[PDB]
Symmetry: D2
C-alpha cells in the first residue's frame, strides 16, 4: 500500500488526466516505446531484420515488465535503462530467442531515457495545450461579454481609475493565448535522442548517408524532431520545457491572484463556480502550482551546465523535477479551464464598488475635463486639494468641488453628473478589448 | 497500475527506508494520528469521554480509509482533511455511533494536516539524522586513518600545494557532523498545530488555565513541541526544515563532487565501492539530490509570505515540496553512508599524482625554506622564474633550481631531497585533523 | 558618472544606513582590515616585527587605494586580492620599505576576501539586528494595546471567525523576535578565514602550539570566531547567512502582505504612516525585498557544493548575491521599523467589517452555544442551512435563526444579542497574546 | 566615495562594456528617453505643440538631473519616476516655462519606468547578441579545425569511447548559436509600455483611430514594439528576458565546466589564453555568472504573478534582478568571446590521454568488429571479461585479447593494430561536425 501516489499532497493535479500521462508506468512505457522505435528504425535502415523489430515491438509493453524491480535496480547504474533492457530482453526471449539479441543494439541508456522523456513531454504538452485552448475560449467569451462592464482598476491595492472587466479578462486571455502558443510550438520541436555511448553513434553503425537515413527513420518511428547534434549535454529541450511550463504556471497564477482579489468578502465582484464559506478553491489550487513550478524550473535550467559527454548528476537531476513540472502545470491548466468556464461575474457589485472612494476614483477624469477651462497644472492642483478635503470632511468629491469658488458655473449640472459617474470614465478600455479580440 | 510511485525517476531514494516514511499513505496515517491524538488530548483535558477517544484511536488506521477517494475528493476544499474526517467518522460509526460525534471536534483542516506534516517530518528526520551519524562515524575513521596520507591540494582545478586526504575527510566530517546536529535539534523542536478555524481555538473550548492544559496534553499525545502561538501563517517550522534539508543535501553534494574529482580516469585517487566502467554512481545519486533540494527549499522558504489567517495557496504549495525534500535528502543520506563506508582510497596513486607538476607543487615550500638566505621577496621572485622555466624546458623544478647561480651551495644535497619531496610539505594538516577529531 | 550606484533600481534600501556598510569601498576596507589584522596577529605571535604591523595598519585605509583599478584588475586572477595587495604594498612602501615586505605574508586571496566578507556581514548583521529589535518593540506595543481589538479572521480570502488585531500583531512579533534572535546568534559565530593556499596554513609557519597561538591571535585582531577547520570549501557560514537573511526577509514579507490585505480600499482597517492616493509604499518596499532574497539565498546555498580545495566558480558566485542579500534585508528591516512604528489601526472600521457577512462569521460560536441543547452534529447541521438561507434571502443569520421552529424559546433574547455579537467570539485570543508577551 | 559600484564583487562584468549600458545613470537616461519620446509622440499625434516636444527632448539629459536625489526620493512613492518628472520639469522650466506644463502629460510611473527598462534591455541585448555572434564565429572555427582531432569522450567522469574535439566544439557552437538567435529575436520584440494610470490610457486622450495613431507614433519615437494590450500586469517581456538570459548564462556555463574539465592538471588537453599557476580564470568567471543568473531569473519569472492593475511589490521586485541578469550575462558573453578566441587546444595531449585506460576505451569498437565472427551477445560478453582482466593484471586490452583461445587467428595483425587504435574509433563524429557546420 506504500507505493501508491494518489496526489494526496498535490490536489491541483489529483484526479486530472495529466496524472496518467506522466506517472511512473507511463514513463516506463515511454522508454519501451523508445526502444521499440529504435529497433524498428534500425530495421527500416537495414541494420537488423524486420521480424526481430516486430517481436520486440510486441513485447515492449509495460504489462510485460516489473516496474518496481526496474526502479529498485537502478541504484546500481544510477538510471533504470539497464534493468529495463534486461527485462525487455527476457520478455522477447520467451517468445523469440533470435529477436532478443537485437534489443537495445548499439544504444545507450541516455538515448532511451531522454527519448522516453521527450515522448512523455510531447503527450503531456498536447493535453496542456488543449486545456489552455479551452481556457482561452472561455476567456475570450468573458472578454467580449464584459467589454463594457465597468469596475475599479486597482493599483498598489487601492482604487485608481475605473476600467472594465472585459479589459481585465482580455489580459488573462493574452497570457493564456501566449502560453498555449508556446506549448504547441515546443511540442512540435521536441527532439529524439540518438547519440550512442558518447554522442558519436559508433554503436549504431557514405557516413553522412547512413546517418541521415537512420536519423530520418528514427524521427518517423518516434514522431519526434530530428536534432542537428546529439544533445546528451546540450540540454536545450529541457531548458525550453522548464521555461514554457514556468511561464504557463505563472500566467495561470496571475489569473488566480486576480480572482482571489476580486472574490474576497469585502469585494465580492466575482465568485468561483460552486458554513456558507464558498472558498475560492480553484484559484487556490492554481496558485499552489504557480508557487512551485518556477522553483522547479530553475533547477531544470541549471542543468544546462552539464559537463563532458554525460554529466555525473546534472542529467540525473532532471527527471523528477521535469515530471513534476508537467504534472503541476497540467493540473493547473485543467483547473484554470474549470475556473474560466464557471466564473461568476457580479456586474452590479462592481458598479457599486466604484463608489467606495466617494468620487475620488474619477478625479483624473474630472481634471481632464476641467483642463480647457483651468489649465492642466491648475486643474490637477485643484483636484488634489479637493480629493484631500473630501477624504477629510467625509464628503464626496462632487460635494467638495461644488464649494470651490474657482468652479462656480464652470459646467452645466447635467455635465457634472456625467463627469462624476465612475461607469463612464473607462478610457479606451473598449477599443483595447476589440483589438485584443480581433487577434 | 498507474498509481504506483516506485522511484522510477528518482534512484537516489528508490528502495531506501525514507520512502515508506513519507509516501502518501504514511501522510494519511500521520493525519489520522493527529486526529486521534487530538481526541485523546481533549479527553485527558475533560472535553470528551475516554471511551470515545479509545474508539476513535482504534479506528484511526490507514487500512480503514480509502486513500484514493480521500485524495481525489480534496479538489472540493483544496485539502484532504474534510474527506479524511468523513471517512474516519464512518469507520468509527460502524463500531461506536456515540464516538463518531466526537471525531474532529472543534478542529480545522490545517491543525490536522500540519500536525501530520510535523509527525512525518519528525520520523523522517530521525532516519536522516541516524544515517548522518553513520556517515560521520565512517568519515571520522577515514580522517584518522589518513591523517598522514599526502595528496595534491587542488585550487581552481590545478595543483596548488600538497595536503592530506585525512584533512579533506575531516572537512567532509565537519559538514556531516554539522548537518546531523541541526537535524536532531530541529527534530526536537518541531511543534504541533492547534489553532482552530482562525487561530483563536474558539472551537476547542480560567482561559489561560484550559489553554495550557489542552496544549500540554496535545504535546503529550503527539510527542511534538508546544509552540508559543498557533502558526497557521507563522511558517517558521517549514522554513527551518527547508533550511536544514538544503544544507544537508548541499553538504553531501560537496562530498559527491569531491569524490567525482578524485575518481575520474586521469586521477583515480579514490574509487566508489563496487565494460570495466565502474562509474561513480553513489556520488552521482547524491549530487542529483543536491541539484534538486535547494530549489525546492527556496519555494518552501517563500511560503513564509502567508497572508491573513490562512493563505489561499502558499500553505498549499508547501506539502509536496516538503515531502520531496525529506525524500531526496533521506535518499542522499542513505547513499552517503554507503559512499563513506565503502570508499576506496589509493594512497600510492595520490603520492604519484603529487609529482605531476614536476616539483612546481612544492615551490611555495621551497620559497619558505630559502627565505632566511635570500629574503622573502627575492625567494618568491626566484621561485616564480624557476617555475616558469621548468614549465618551459620540460625539466623538473629541482633541475632548474640546480642551475641558478644564486643557489649554488645554498643547501646540503640531503636537505634538497627533503625540500623537493611533495609528501613532506603538508603544512599543519596533521594538527588540523587532530583538533577536528578531538571535537 | 557611470560608476554611481545610488539605489535607483532598489528603493527598499536607497538612503538606508546598510548601503554604506556593504558598498564596494566598505568591502575594500574590510579586506584591508583583514590584511592588517593578519599582520598584527602574526606580530603578536612572533612571526614578524611590530613596527611592520603598525605601519601596515596605518596604510590599510581605503583612501590610500584606487578602488576602480583594483576592481578592474581582478579579471586577471578572478578576484581583487592580488591587485589590492599590490596597491597596499606600494602604499606601505612609500612610508616604510621594510614593512612592505611583510604585507600579505604566507597568505592567500581567499583568507583575505572571506575574512573581509565575514567582517562586512558582522557589521551589517549588527545593524539588521538592531532594527529588528526596534520593530519588535513597536510590534509588542501594538500587540499589548490591541489585545482586545476585535477583527475578522480571514482564511482563504474570506471571513472565517473573529479574532483580535492584538493576536495578529503578536504573530508579527513572533516572527521578528525569531529573526532578530538568529541574526544575533549568527553574528556572534561568524568565523575568520585563515587557511593558506590550500588550507594547510603552510605559508604562515609544537605544531598544535603555534596553530592555536596564531588562531587565537587572529580571532583577537579580527573579533571574529575561531573555526575548527579552514572553510575555503566548507561554506557553512555563507549558507547560514543565506538562511537567516531569507527567513528575515520572508518574515517581514509576511507583515507586508498582511498590511496590504488590511490597507486596501474595501477594507481600510490599517493605514501606513503618511490625488489622495496614500499607497502602502512601505509594505510595497518590504514585499519587493521578500520577492528577491529567497531566490538569491538559493544560489548562495548551492555554493555549499564547492569542489576540491577551492572551487573554480562557486566561491566566486557568492560575493555579489551575499552583498545583495545583506543590502535588501537591511533595507527591509529599516523599512519594517518605520512600518511597525507608524502603523495606524482603525479599530472602528475593524468592528464594522465584522458585520459584513451578516452574522455568518459567528455561526461557529452559535453552534457551540446551541450544542448543549441540540447536540453537536445537529447544531452544526442547523447552522449550515441557516448560513445558506441567510446567504440567499439576503437576511442576517440572526433573522434566519429566529424563524427555525427548532430554535423557539431556546435562549433568552439578551443571550441572543450576546451570541450574535462578532466582537465577543474571539476564542482565547486574549490569553494567547499574554503568553506571547510574557516571553 | 561610498556610491561607486566598480564591479568589486563581480569581476565577470567589471570593465566590460555592458556595465555602462545598465548602470544607474543609464537607466535614468533611459527613463528620460521614454518621457521625451512620449511627448514627441503626443506631438506627432496632435495632443501637444512641437516646440514643447523639442524643448522637453533637449532637457531630457542625465546631466540635467540629480541622480542621487531622484534615487533617494523614491522611498516616498516606491519608484523614482515622480522625483524624476519633477526634476525634468524644473530643467525644462528654466528654459521654456510653457513646455514644462507638458512634461509627463496623461502618463504614469510604470509607463516611463518599464519603457526605460525595455530600452536598457534592448541596448544591452544588442551588445550581448553581438558578443555571442563573435563567440560563435570562433567556435565554428574551432569546430572546423578540429573535426578530426581525436580525444576521450567522458561520461560520468570516466573515459567511455573516443570522440573529436571538433564534435565537442560544435556542441558549444550549437548552444551559443541558439542563444544568440533568441537574444536577437527577443530584442526585436521588446515592447514599449503605454497604459496610463490603470491601463485604459484615459489620461492620454474614433477611439480606435486615436489609439492606433498614438501607439504607432510611440513605437516610432521609441523604436520599441507595439503590444496588443498594456502589460503593466502581463509581464511576458520580463519573463522572456528572464528565460533567454538564464539560457544564455547556462549555455556559457556549459562551455566553462567543459574547459575546466579539460584544463585541469591531470588532463591538460586545453588551456585558457595567458608561481606558474595559469588558473582557468575566464571559465571561472563565466561559471560564476552561470551560478547566479538562473536563481535571479526565477525571481523574475515569479513576478508574472502580478495582482490587479499594478502589483504592490512584484513589479518592484523586477528592476534590480533584471539589471543584474543583463549585467552578469553581458559580462559572461564578453568573457566567453575571449575564452573561445584564445583557447589553446593540445591535440597531442588528447591523443596521449586516449591511452590511459590501456585500450578499454576502444572495447566497444572491438566488440563491433568481432560481431560478424562471434555474434553480438558473445562478442560483448568476451570483451567484458577481457576489460576486467586487463583492469586486473595491469595489462593492456590488446594483451589480454591476445591470450583468449576464442580469438586465435580471428584477425590479421595489421587489422588488430587498426582496431586497437583509439584515434580511429570516433564513430561518425566527422559527419556530425559537417552537418552542424552546414547550418
Ligand atoms: O550513465 C549512463 O547512463 C551510461 C554511462 C556509461 O555508459 O558509461
Ligand atoms: O505519438 C504518440 O504516441 C503521442 C503523440 C502526442 O500525444 O502528441
Ligand atoms: O482551508 C482550509 O483548510 C479551511 C478553510 C476554512 O475553514 O475556511
Ligand atoms: O512518535 C512517533 O511515532 C515517532 C517519533 C520519531 O520517529 O521520532
Ligand atoms: O583563486 C584564488 O584566489 C587563488 C588561487 C591560487 O592561488 O591558486
Ligand atoms: O569590529 C568591527 O569593526 C565592527 C563589529 C560589529 O559591527 O559588530
Ligand atoms: O505605483 C505607481 O508607480 C503609481 C501608483 C498610482 O499611481 O496609484
Ligand atoms: O534606440 C537606441 O537608442 C538603441 C537601440 C539598440 O541599441 O538596439
Amino acid at each position: 500500500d506504500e507505493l501508491l501516489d494518489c496526489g494526496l499532497l498535490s490536489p491541483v493535479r489529483a484526479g486530472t488526466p495529466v496524472e496518467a500521462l506522466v506517472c511512473d508506468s507511463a514513463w516506463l512505457q515511454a522508454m519501451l516505446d523508445a526502444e521499440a522505435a529504435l529497433t524498428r528504425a534500425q530495421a527500416r535502415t537495414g541494420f537488423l531484420p524486420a521480424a526481430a523489430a516486430e517481436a520486440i515491438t510486441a513485447a515492449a509493453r509495460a504489462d510485460r515488465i516489473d516496474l518496481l524491480a526496474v526502479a529498485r535496480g537502478a541504484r546500481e547504474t544510477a538510471n533504470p535503462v539497464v534493468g529495463l533492457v534486461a527485462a525487455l530482453t527476457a520478455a522477447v526471449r520467451r517468445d523469440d530467442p533470435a529477436a532478443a539479441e537485437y534489443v537495445h543494439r548499439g544504444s545507450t541508456s541516455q538515448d532511451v531515457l531522454d527519448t522516453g522523456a521527450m515522448l512523455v513531454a510531447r503527450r503531456a504538452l498536447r493535453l496542456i495545450g488543449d486545456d489552455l485552448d479551452r481556457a482561452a475560449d472561455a476567456l475570450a467569451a468573458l472578454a467580449a461579454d464584459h467589454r463594457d462592464t465597468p469596475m475599479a482598476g486597482r493599483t498598489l491595492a487601492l482604487h485608481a481609475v475605473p476600467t472594465t472587466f472585459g479589459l481585465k479578462a482580455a489580459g488573462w486571455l493574452e497570457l493564456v493565448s501566449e502560453a498555449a502558443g508556446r506549448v504547441a510550438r515546443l511540442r512540435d520541436g521536441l527532439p529524439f535522442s540518438l547519440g550512442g555511448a558518447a554522442g558519436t553513434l559508433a554503436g549504431y553503425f557514405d557516413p553522412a548517408v547512413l546517418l541521415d537515413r537512420l536519423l530520418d527513420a528514427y524521427a518517423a518511428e518516434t514522431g519526434l524532431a530530428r536534432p542537428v547534434l546529439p544533445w546528451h549535454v546540450l540540454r536545450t529541450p529541457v531548458a525550453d520545457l522548464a521555461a514554457v511550463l514556468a511561464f504557463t504556471a505563472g500566467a495561470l497564477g496571475k489569473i488566480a491572484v486576480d480572482v482571489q482579489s476580486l472574490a474576497r468578502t469585502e469585494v465580492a465582484e466575482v465568485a468561483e463556480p460552486a458554513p456558507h464559506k464558498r472558498n475560492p478553491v480553484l484559484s487556490t489550487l492554481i496558485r499552489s502550482a504557480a508557487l512551485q513550478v518556477p522553483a522547479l524550473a530553475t533547477g531544470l535550467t541549471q542543468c544546462l551546465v552539464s559537463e563532458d559527454e554525460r554529466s555525473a548528476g546534472a542529467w540525473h537531476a532532471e527527471w523528477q523535477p521535469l515530471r513534476e513540472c508537467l504534472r503541476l502545470t497540467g493540473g493547473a491548466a485543467r483547473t484554470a479551464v474549470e475556473l474560466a468556464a464557471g466564473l461568476e461575474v457580479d456586474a452590479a457589485r462592481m458598479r457599486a464598488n466604484l463608489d467606495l472612494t466617494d468620487g475620488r476614483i474619477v478625479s483624473e477624469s474630472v481634471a481632464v475635463a476641467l483642463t480647457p477651462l483651468l489649465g492642466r497644472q491648475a486643474a490637477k492642483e485643484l483636484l488634489t486639494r479637493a480629493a484631500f478635503t473630501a477624504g477629510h470632511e467625509g464628503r464626496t468629491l462632487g460635494e467638495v468641488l461644488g464649494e470651490l469658488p474657482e468652479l462656480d458655473g464652470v459646467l452645466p449640472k447635467e455635465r457634472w453628473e456625467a463627469l462624476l459617474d465612475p461607469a463612464r470614465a473607462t478610457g479606451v478600455a473598449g477599443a483595447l478589448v476589440d483589438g485584443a479580440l480581433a487577434r
